[PDB]
Amino acid sequence: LTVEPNLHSLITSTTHKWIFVGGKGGVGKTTSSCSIAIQMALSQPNKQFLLISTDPAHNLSDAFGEKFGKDARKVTGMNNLSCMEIDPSAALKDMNDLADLTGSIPGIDEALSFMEVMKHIKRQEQDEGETFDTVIFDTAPTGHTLRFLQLPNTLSKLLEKFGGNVDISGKLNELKANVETIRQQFTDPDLTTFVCVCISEFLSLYETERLIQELISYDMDVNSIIVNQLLFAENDQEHQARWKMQKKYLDQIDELYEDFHVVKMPLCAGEIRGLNNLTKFSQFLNKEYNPITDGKVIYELE
Amino acid sequence: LTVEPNLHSLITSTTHKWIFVGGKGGVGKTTSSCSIAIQMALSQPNKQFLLISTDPAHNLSDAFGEKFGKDARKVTGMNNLSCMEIDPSAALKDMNDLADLTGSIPGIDEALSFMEVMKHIKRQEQDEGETFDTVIFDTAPTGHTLRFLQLPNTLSKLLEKFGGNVDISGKLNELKANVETIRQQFTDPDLTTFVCVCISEFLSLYETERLIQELISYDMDVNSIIVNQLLFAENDQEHQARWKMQKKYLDQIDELYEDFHVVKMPLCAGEIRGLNNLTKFSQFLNKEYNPITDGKVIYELE
Amino acid sequence: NELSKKYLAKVKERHELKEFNNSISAQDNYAKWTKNNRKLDSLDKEINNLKDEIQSENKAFQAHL
Amino acid sequence: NELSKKYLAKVKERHELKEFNNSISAQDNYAKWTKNNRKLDSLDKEINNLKDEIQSENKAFQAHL
Ligand SMILES: Nc1ncnc2c1ncn2[C@@H]1O[C@H](COP(=O)(O)OP(=O)(O)O)[C@@H](O)[C@H]1O
Ligand SMILES: Nc1ncnc2c1ncn2[C@@H]1O[C@H](COP(=O)(O)OP(=O)(O)O)[C@@H](O)[C@H]1O
Numbered sequence A, B: 001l002t003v004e005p006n007l008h009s010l011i012t013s014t015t016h017k018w019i020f021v022g023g024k025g026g027v028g029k030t031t032s033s034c035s036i037a038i039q040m041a042l043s044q045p046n047k048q049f050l051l052i053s054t055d056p057a058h059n060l061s062d063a064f065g066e067k068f069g070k071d072a073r074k075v076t077g078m079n080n081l082s083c084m085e086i087d088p089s090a091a092l093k094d095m096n097d098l099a100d101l102t103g104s105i106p107g108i109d110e111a112l113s114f115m116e117v118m119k120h121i122k123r124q125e126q127d128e129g130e131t132f133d134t135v136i137f138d139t140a141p142t143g144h145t146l147r148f149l150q151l152p153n154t155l156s157k158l159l160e161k162f163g164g165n166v167d168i169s170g171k172l173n174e175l176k177a178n179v180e181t182i183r184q185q186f187t188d189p190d191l192t193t194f195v196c197v198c199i200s201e202f203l204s205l206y207e208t209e210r211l212i213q214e215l216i217s218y219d220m221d222v223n224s225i226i227v228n229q230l231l232f233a234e235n236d237q238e239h240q241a242r243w244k245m246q247k248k249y250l251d252q253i254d255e256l257y258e259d260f261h262v263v264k265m266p267l268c269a270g271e272i273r274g275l276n277n278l279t280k281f282s283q284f285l286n287k288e289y290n291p292i293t294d295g296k297v298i299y300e301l302e
Numbered sequence C, D: 001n002e003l004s005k006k007y008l009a010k011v012k013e014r015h016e017l018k019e020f021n022n023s024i025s026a027q028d029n030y031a032k033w034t035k036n037n038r039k040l041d042s043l044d045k046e047i048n049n050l051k052d053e054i055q056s057e058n059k060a061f062q063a064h065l
Helices: A010-014 A028-043 A059-064 A099-106 A108-127 A147-155 A175-186 A201-217 A241-254 A275-284 B006-013 B029-042 B061-063 B100-104 B108-127 B148-156 B175-184 B201-216 B241-256 B274-285 C004-020 C030-053 D003-022 D030-055
Strands: A020-022 A049-053 A081-083 A134-138 A192-199 A222-230 A259-266 B018-022 B050-051 B082-084 B136-138 B192-199 B222-230 B259-268
Touching: A010 B100, A010 B148, A020 A028, A020 B100, A020 B222, A028 A049, A028 A059, A028 A081, A028 A134, A028 A192, A028 A222, A028 B175, A049 A059, A049 A108, A059 A081, A059 A275, A081 A108, A108 A147, A108 A175, A108 B082, A108 D003, A134 A259, A134 B201, A147 A175, A147 A201, A147 A222, A192 A201, A192 B222, A201 A222, A201 C030, A241 A259, A259 A275, B006 B029, B006 B201, B029 B050, B029 B061, B029 B136, B029 B192, B029 B222, B029 B274, B050 B061, B050 B108, B050 D030, B061 B082, B061 B274, B082 B108, B108 B175, B148 B175, B148 B201, B175 C030, B201 B222, B201 B241, B201 D030, B222 B241, B241 B259, B259 B274
Parallel strands: A020 A134, A020 A192, A049 A081, A049 A134, A192 A222, A222 A259, B018 B136, B018 B192, B050 B082, B050 B136, B192 B222, B222 B259
Antiparallel strands: none
16 A cells, blocks of 8 residues: 555646645756646646746746746647746835835745735736636745745734734734635645655755655645656666665655655756657656666657 | 966965855765865865864764764874864754844844854864864855854944844944954955855756855855866766766856866765765865876775 | 653653764665654754743743732 | 936846846856846846935935925
């Protein structure tokens, strides 16, 4: 009664509506984020999807080779996957031209920025009269993007014992709502979930361990880890020191998280860009990659 | 009139007293931190050294295979390099059993923790009557360890326009001193400097770029970048897709930082632990590694 | 019997575990290493709970004659 | 002539540069890409300086009859 080493369960799911993808270091968060989308978009034609990114470097545009902006466009070559690239930090900075009690309260700026995103989304579903059944978040590379989930509990730990010198204590109780309505959702293992990307090296396994903890505290559902850029060097056409170490950690991770969906991806020769390759690579999130038989498909990519 | 691609200039220097080593991701900060020490310790026998680490996982003890604690021990096999492993976060947490105005002011906790370190050092030079001419910092893996350098300027931007309900505004002016006496030093390109470790992949080059900026703001001297874990795959005894990309970035970095000491280290087969290997590997910080001639020395390591 | 036998058992246990974790390669035994850590992170809070359990029972007897 | 021709020239230039940076592979042209960025980070402040240069000259004429 072991757990399947892949995301099929997730890509098959019909219940989820929110899926978060993240991991520090250049380990392939973006690549994975796109992969989960396409895979989710191909396995359920009826549903309409949205892959969104907060990163300012416009990575999803780099990943697909297309120019996606603030307007929810559809991937060229797809039918139910739409990408949206937005910068909240800038947006929230214009309707702020004070926030003094924001820097004061850890977690405000985030919640704010987030809601600034949701807005830009419901706005897209209006001018487009198109409802998104599931959204995928390409979590910001640095910073705790979604820390606001604690905002509720913390805003209570400073109200019973703490204080228009009060119009502040109002539009604040009004927030500890928007956030708890949300947190309640993301804290539902059936509606939302988080997938952690990671490379199989020490410092990376640490970080992702940290993160997993961070999500645990927030009461977010962490269930899957995709270990990217693996070698499996021994299954090449012919003769490796790194694979020895990676393998080392892989065994450790399998032992640490026995109830987790640990996915092992291969390190292809060169970039994995554009729908044709992304799709080709992504399928290894569904049916686990087999170094033997699938050794070739990893050389079709450029 | 180009710049030497190595640290010889630094390892030769007699003026410096403080050298900071850091970089996120598992790129070898620790390995580099140890390497700069040993190299500095061997090239100047007269001087006495100290390699210190804040990391709780006790990494320097892992790197050398010895058990270094809070007491400045000497490396077994060395003569002027001493390692000291301390956890400030815990220390500062005992004489705090409020800090309310700490979380309030960004940069306090750090300065505090730092000074808590310096103390533990001058304390070692007393019970040991042994003065350290130069110290090397194995900067904490996550968090802006040394952000306090802004503490001065910020404490001024909230005094002329802001307020024992005042014994606070006193032991605070007393701090904006300890910190500025220090900042003045670290901001002296002759006494202190920072070396950034980085792997030659995108996400890592970004981060280190970020960091470099962060240090620039603090007015700290950033002059050297050591790009670790390189392949140079074409100089192996016999036939590589990653080296193609790495090489790609390497060219970019040389172009971005023309006045910087960009050091290229090799990726050896397996761990680089203990004095015998560390020393062997470290020499490539002084005389740059040549893939051709030095291709063997990278296989003597385990 | 609580704010003592508890605040010690643990702080002690923690202290005991802490030294042990520092006797294993966080690298060759990442598995165990991180397990222990996760644990210490737990004790680290219930000890910080008994630190308020023992402090609420003070602000209690003094706020109530 | 300052709090206008300046606050625009730049905000404009910045705005102009911003769109350009979004026309190059942060990956194949990391070199240029990061250069531009470093620049924008500069304009990002002198614009935030003219935002206080223009605001100190207001709290000035009104604090001085
Ligand atoms: N499994 C893999 N094998 C080979 N190359 C990969 C793999 N995953 C990602 N890449 C490369 O890394 C780049 C994407 O890195 P990225 O995912 O953006 O790092 P991050 O997720 O931290 O932003 C792509 O250009 C691609 O060439
Ligand atoms: N140039 C290198 N070649 C091969 N292995 C390396 C190299 N540098 C570091 N390592 C390996 O990485 C480990 C140290 O990683 P570490 O330096 O602690 O990452 P970090 O600096 O982020 O903490 C060692 O166990 C060693 O085996």
